[PDB]
Input
Amino acid sequence: WWWLRKIW
Output
């Protein structure tokens, strides 16, 4: 994804 790594 993108929000996953950003949130993580």
Observations:
- The chain is about 60% helix and 0% strand.
- The longest helix spans residues 3-7.
